[PDB]
Design a protein around this ligand. Structure first.
Ligand code: MG
Ligand code: MG
Ligand code: MG
Ligand code: MG
Ligand code: MG
Ligand code: MG
Ligand code: MG
Ligand code: MG
Ligand code: MG
Ligand code: MG
Ligand code: MG
Ligand code: MG
Ligand code: MG
Ligand code: MG
Ligand code: MG
Ligand code: MG
Ligand code: MG
Ligand code: MG
Ligand code: MG
Ligand code: MG
Ligand code: MG
Ligand code: MG
Ligand code: MG
Ligand code: MG
Ligand code: MG
Ligand code: MG
Ligand code: MG
Ligand code: MG
Ligand code: MG
Ligand code: MG
Ligand code: MG
Ligand code: MG
Ligand code: MG
Ligand code: MG
Ligand code: MG
Ligand code: MG
Ligand code: MG
Ligand code: MG
Ligand code: MG
Ligand code: MG
Ligand code: MG
Ligand code: MG
Ligand code: MG
Ligand code: MG
Ligand code: MG
Ligand code: MG
Ligand code: MG
Ligand code: MG
Ligand code: MG
Ligand code: MG
Ligand code: MG
Ligand code: MG
Ligand code: MG
Ligand code: MG
Ligand code: MG
Ligand code: MG
Ligand code: MG
Ligand code: MG
Ligand code: MG
Ligand code: MG
Ligand code: MG
Ligand code: MG
Ligand code: MG
Ligand code: MG
Ligand code: MG
Ligand code: ZN
Ligand code: ZN
Lengths: 83, 50, 99, 239, 52
RNA sequence: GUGAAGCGGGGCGAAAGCCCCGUGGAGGCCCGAAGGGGUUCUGAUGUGCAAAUCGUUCCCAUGACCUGGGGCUAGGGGCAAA
RNA sequence: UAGUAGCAGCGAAGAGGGGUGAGAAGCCCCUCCGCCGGAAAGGACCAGGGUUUCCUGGCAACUUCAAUAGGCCAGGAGUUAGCCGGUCCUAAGGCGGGGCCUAAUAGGCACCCGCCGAAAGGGAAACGGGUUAAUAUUCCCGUGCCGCGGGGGUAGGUUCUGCGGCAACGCAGGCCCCGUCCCCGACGCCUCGGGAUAGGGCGGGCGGGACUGCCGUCCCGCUUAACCGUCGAAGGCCGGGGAGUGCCGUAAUGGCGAGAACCGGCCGAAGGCGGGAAUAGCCGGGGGUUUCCCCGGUCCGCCCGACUCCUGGGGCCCGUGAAAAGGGGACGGGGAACGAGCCCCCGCGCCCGUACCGAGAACCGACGCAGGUGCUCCUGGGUGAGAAGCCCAAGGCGGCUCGGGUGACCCCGGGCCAGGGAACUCGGCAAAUUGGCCCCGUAACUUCGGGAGAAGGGGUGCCUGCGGUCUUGGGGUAUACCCCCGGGACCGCAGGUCGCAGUGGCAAGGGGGACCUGACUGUUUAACAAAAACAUAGGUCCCCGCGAGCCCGUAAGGGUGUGUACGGGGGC
RNA sequence: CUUAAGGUAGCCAAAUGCCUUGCCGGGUAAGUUCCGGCGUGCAUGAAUGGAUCAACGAGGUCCCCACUGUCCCGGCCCGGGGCCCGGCGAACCCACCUCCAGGUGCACAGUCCUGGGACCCCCGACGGGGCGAGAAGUCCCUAUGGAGCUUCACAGCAGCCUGUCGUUGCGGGUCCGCUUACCCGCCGCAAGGCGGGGACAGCGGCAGGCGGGCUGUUCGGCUGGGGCGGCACA
């Protein structure tokens, strides 16, 4: 745990306590947000900051939800209706 | 080291238990023939290869 | 002919090192490499982004295509382009061949 | 001790090997592709000599091919005997018309592609000899060979041409390239060593060596190896 | 530098640890066998006739 | 600290263009701490602080850079910008 | 030899008084004096060490001197975890079984199967206060979190489907099993705009402290964790709109019928604020007893602001900057009649580490060794370009473990030296000169980039006023401009004046001409050689079309090769 | 003509020129170095790289300005050693232990000869002597001593090339064909399938060639030291 704090994997956060001491808290970085399977851009509705796995994220109310953006879904539906 | 494996720690424990001279009543019992122990060592001088 | 230099241009980052001939070959290539080109798809006169040697991206229409190491289209590459992109010439020839 | 550098390379030490874990996978034809596919990505692969295209077939099979010059993301390509000879299409060699520039040419069907894979290279389809299932192609070196007519090639030239025309201006630039390749960088001349380390090592005025025969054993077979000739006269006789 | 200064770097590493079979400080952790009794590479006990 | 490509303005001018000022932030770029190295005094030491050190003066210091942990290559063999 | 050398050199050091004791320069207490303060020195901590930790006692030995001291000796004691690490995952790689090879094996490994491989990568969940002689995210108090399981309520369901919004998307969004797909995990370097926090400062207030010659100034406290909720800058997106006499911009690049301006909305950081929480802690004033109780304060208004945290823009690459566990979502298939991601409530969380040093005395170097490892990670104020030096805090040290006297020579390390100025010497070796910043100015030559800080000339302190360019808040009709008030940064002008000297210490280039030589940066004989040697980019030749060429292996087989002539190998 | 050609462009008393401080200029009062020219160049020269210095240099060198305790030529001062006292308390070295002169001697005597001196003890200093101490001389030679390296040494072994024997079978007239052996690749867990080659190749034995890639060795003697020479080696 000391060399583990010499690496920059964790955030170094300096905080003052109610006891008057200034300490360093080593905190996790945010996980990356879900990305569109086509464009790789963050998906709307799910790009909130999350700091651990195992947290349920609600996908937008749309077919294919948090898998592709609305732009990809609409275009793909337009292609299928014709075809 | 701070982070020890138990197997190494138990070998260190054995060396700590054995590092001492014969008791004074042993010296009396043997008419001063037994006064030293081969397990007697100093942490700075005689190094364990633990 | 350049922003602050007479002839060295982009090779000005090398200073007086490596020899005139070497820095001249670099300048000849990089003037085209870092200049403006025409997108093969949208035909806009834009500075295309080179993601890596041989990979070019158009910031206007998003066209991502394979090209030369330092220029988007090599001399021999130009003659064997995909024909889904030579749609302007197919219609130009037909218009001349109809009216 | 005394084994010279070329002899130590064959042991496959880490400094002589290819760091192929830096790449996504081999750039080869799968044995059973057919139909239409889509170019879904075009990528730089460390240590390779050309950009690589990721192609997704209709049945979901993905494979890597060297990107033809002009190929673009989202392009629809066709694989098989029915495919028109358009750039990026993968065709059996017996179906490709003569005079067509092709690349990533299989020598036998299913070997994945062997010839004309470096950036800017291509092979020319010279003739067809279908009574024995052979196609005649000219390779980038100028050599004319026969290949299995059922083997696959891609239409066009390999993208990324012109890379070697720009000088590696600094030692450091080639150093970074070498780290993605297998080359040992840098190299020491033989005559810069002592005799124990090279046939050319030694004398007060160090010299190169005269050519060795083709039968020379390893550790002796350095310098010119059974060369037909040397110098400008050899080039003139080559022509 | 090869003498006293380089001895300073022998303060933190190891080649061998204690062997569970023979108890000597001879188990090569990288090679994963004992340099004295051969445990980890040889189920028979290593002992050569050139050794007294 | 310097100030590449690129980008503004002004001046001269017939055209091309040339000049000045700015903006910009490139480079195995420069000065120089840390860090790395090891040139000089042929300084001190030379039964040493030390079986290779110390002072001083120096070289590099965004990179073919310095450094931790893990891993691979073993003796006629390895590894070697030799 | 000899009671001799050494116990100096590496930029700290002691003194007075008292106590203890047989005995005190040296142990303990106070006072004075000094050293470090981006650290041979303060804070943390890995490996290694292994009890060196703490308490009591002691001085035969041990400590370059002494000793009542001690990392020494004797006796006793001390390390507490669901949430801190290991444990889990895979990396480069490794091992075992099978098989193939082998005279044979404990020898080899391309193949199949499995496993191992990180206390700095990935990765479930804990913070604050108090307590001990010695442990502290582990004990105690308070307030929580994670995983797994259960009970109740609720939404919902019970052939069949959740509701709203044009949309971006919002909202308790039923239950069990299985499958597939996608995404997160998951990533370089350079550079520049924006937002915060840690920290620092200024003015006022309340309390307390310092000093006495004069003044009345100076210093300290005024804090707020995890967790719950809410808000959300950039960026992206949705709807309206429908633009070329253009119109909208940036630190910079710029943007638009391939849909601009403008209007409305959606998703959306660090962090802020409330709750936690003043009941704690701190400061001050009292009373107890053995650490408990009471009382008062814990404030107002501004400024700077990171190397810490967040965000976005731009650029570079013949260089493209891991993988897997795990997790989330969606899309499907099957089943039951019940039943949740919401609220209340119950249960369980094994195993190992945990003391201390972490180094000019706890590691390695035979040592209590000026080396090496680890300055690995962190650091307040003034001056200053500065994480430089110098001075001083917080905090520590006087233990780089001899003391005193004398003031010959000589040695080591420093200072100054009239006149001359390289006459010294192999040689200007050593020393000296120069030195920061601003202005003016700058040659031959040149690969046109450079040469260049070329060279050379001038200025520099303090004080008294007057201005300017911005910035940050508040108040004025008042989002820019303008006026008023408070704070911050930088620049200029006029005048007065002192010194031998104003970059006054500290810090801090001597310069120019020419030849030989290697183009350059780089590398090298660890311990007598740093170079003109090696490498290098560039040039050129050779072997090679891949069942190749070259190389390794007894063999099975292997490297180049996850490669393919713009390529691999081999010379110069 | 000689072992082919017969040193071109250039460059030079060169980090390459012996003679040689070459000759003529520059710079100094005085220049064996340096710079600029000259060149039948002992013995310069083209990727064995020639010419060539922009930029760069802890490279090697010469000149100029500035500067100075480098020097003329030495002086004074500061801190620590030093010296004296208290405390701790080694090592090197050591047959015994040695005043001076001139001799003699294994030819460079503390010890022998003939002289000259010296009252003895103690302190500080130095480095002339003790052929001072350190280290079984690395120089040189000898040894029927090594190691490593070289090749046109004496031998040998791999490796590669080549023939042959076997693997090698089936049809037709040494030739053609075939596939099932065998080989190469793809798919498959395996079974086996597909394609190519094909009695070749590959592999084993035997034989020849190339073979300092690797292994072992030999590289004599005499000698006014060794070496070259000579053969005084029969
Ligand atoms: Mg970790
Ligand atoms: Mg991370
Ligand atoms: Mg030790
Ligand atoms: Mg490599
Ligand atoms: Mg050499
Ligand atoms: Mg050799
Ligand atoms: Mg040879
Ligand atoms: Mg040679
Ligand atoms: Mg060694
Ligand atoms: Mg190891
Ligand atoms: Mg640099
Ligand atoms: Mg020297
Ligand atoms: Mg010396
Ligand atoms: Mg000495
Ligand atoms: Mg520097
Ligand atoms: Mg002394
Ligand atoms: Mg000081
Ligand atoms: Mg002291
Ligand atoms: Mg101080
Ligand atoms: Mg400082
Ligand atoms: Mg410290
Ligand atoms: Mg203690
Ligand atoms: Mg005690
Ligand atoms: Mg003890
Ligand atoms: Mg594991
Ligand atoms: Mg403690
Ligand atoms: Mg105040
Ligand atoms: Mg800017
Ligand atoms: Mg602890
Ligand atoms: Mg000490
Ligand atoms: Mg203090
Ligand atoms: Mg003294
Ligand atoms: Mg003087
Ligand atoms: Mg002189
Ligand atoms: Mg003289
Ligand atoms: Mg000097
Ligand atoms: Mg100074
Ligand atoms: Mg060089
Ligand atoms: Mg050396
Ligand atoms: Mg040296
Ligand atoms: Mg060289
Ligand atoms: Mg050249
Ligand atoms: Mg040659
Ligand atoms: Mg000539
Ligand atoms: Mg020349
Ligand atoms: Mg000459
Ligand atoms: Mg000369
Ligand atoms: Mg010649
Ligand atoms: Mg030469
Ligand atoms: Mg020659
Ligand atoms: Mg040359
Ligand atoms: Mg250099
Ligand atoms: Mg004494
Ligand atoms: Mg005589
Ligand atoms: Mg004698
Ligand atoms: Mg004496
Ligand atoms: Mg001898
Ligand atoms: Mg000897
Ligand atoms: Mg003999
Ligand atoms: Mg055959
Ligand atoms: Mg054979
Ligand atoms: Mg030999
Ligand atoms: Mg003989
Ligand atoms: Mg002889
Ligand atoms: Mg002879
Ligand atoms: Zn485009
Ligand atoms: Zn064992």
């Amino acid at each position: 745990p000391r060399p583990a704090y010499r690496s920059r994997s964790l955030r170094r956060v300096k905080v003052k306590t109610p006891g008057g001491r200034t300490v360093v808290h080593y905190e996790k970085r945010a996980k990356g947000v879900p990305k569109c399977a086509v464009t790789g851009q963050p998906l709307g509705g799910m790009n909130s900051k999350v700091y651990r796995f195992g947290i349920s994220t609600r996908a937008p109310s749309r077919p294919y939800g948090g898998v592709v953006s609305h732009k990809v879904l609409a275009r793909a539906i337009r292609y299928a209706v014709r075809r | 080291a701070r982070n020890k494996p138990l197997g190494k720690k138990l070998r260190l424990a054995a060396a700590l238990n054995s590092n001492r001279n014969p008791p004074l009543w042993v010296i009396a019992k043997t008419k001063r023939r037994v006064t030293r122990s081969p397990a007697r060592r100093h942490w700075r001088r005689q190094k364990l290869k633990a | 002919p350049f922003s602050h230099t007479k002839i060295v241009g982009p090779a000005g980052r090398y200073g007086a090192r490596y020899g005139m001939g070497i820095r001249r070959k670099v300048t000849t290539i990089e003037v085209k490499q870092r200049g403006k080109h025409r997108c093969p798809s949208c035909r806009s006169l834009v500075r295309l982004e080179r993601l890596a040697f041989g990979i070019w991206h158009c910031p206007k229409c998003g066209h991502t295509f394979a090209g030369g190491a330092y220029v988007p289209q090599t001399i021999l590459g130009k003659t064997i382009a995909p024909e889904e992109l030579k749609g302007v010439e197919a219609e130009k020839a037909k218009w001349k061949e109809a009216a | 001790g005394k084994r010279i550098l070329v002899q130590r390379r064959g042991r496959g030490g880490s400094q002589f090997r290819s760091p192929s874990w830096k790449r996504d996978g081999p750039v080869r034809y799968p044995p059973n592709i057919s139909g239409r596919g889509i170019v879904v990505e075009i990528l730089h692969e460390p240590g390779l000599n050309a950009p690589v295209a990721k192609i997704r077939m209709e049945n979901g099979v993905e494979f890597f091919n060297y990107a033809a010059e002009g190929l673009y993301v989202g392009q629809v390509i066709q694989v098989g005997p029915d495919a028109p000879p358009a750039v990026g299409n993968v065709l059996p060699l017996g179906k490709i018309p003569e005079g067509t520039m092709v690349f990533n040419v299989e020598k036998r069907f299913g070997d994945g592609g062997k010839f004309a894979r470096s950036g800017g290279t291509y092979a020319l389809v010279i003739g067809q000899r279908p009574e024995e299932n052979k196609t005649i192609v000219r390779l980038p070196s100028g050599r004319v060979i026969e290949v299995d007519a059922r083997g696959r090639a891609t239409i066009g030239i390999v993208a990324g041409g012109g890379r070697v025309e720009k000088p590696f201006v600094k030692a450091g630039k080639k150093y970074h390239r070498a780290r993605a390749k297998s080359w040992k960088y840098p190299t020491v001349r033989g005559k810069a060593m002592s005799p124990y380390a090279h046939p050319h090592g030694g004398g007060s005025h160090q010299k190169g060596g005269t050519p060795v025969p083709k039968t020379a054993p390893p550790g002796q077979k350095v310098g010119f190896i059974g060369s037909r000739c040397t110098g400008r006269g050899c080039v003139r006789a080559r022509a | 530098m090869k003498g006293t200064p380089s001895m300073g770097k022998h303060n933190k590493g190891k080649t061998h640890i204690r062997c569970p079979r023979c108890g000597r400080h001879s188990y090569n952790v990288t090679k994963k066998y004992c340099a004295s009794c051969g445990w980890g590479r040889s189920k028979r006990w290593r002992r050569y006739n050139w050794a007294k």
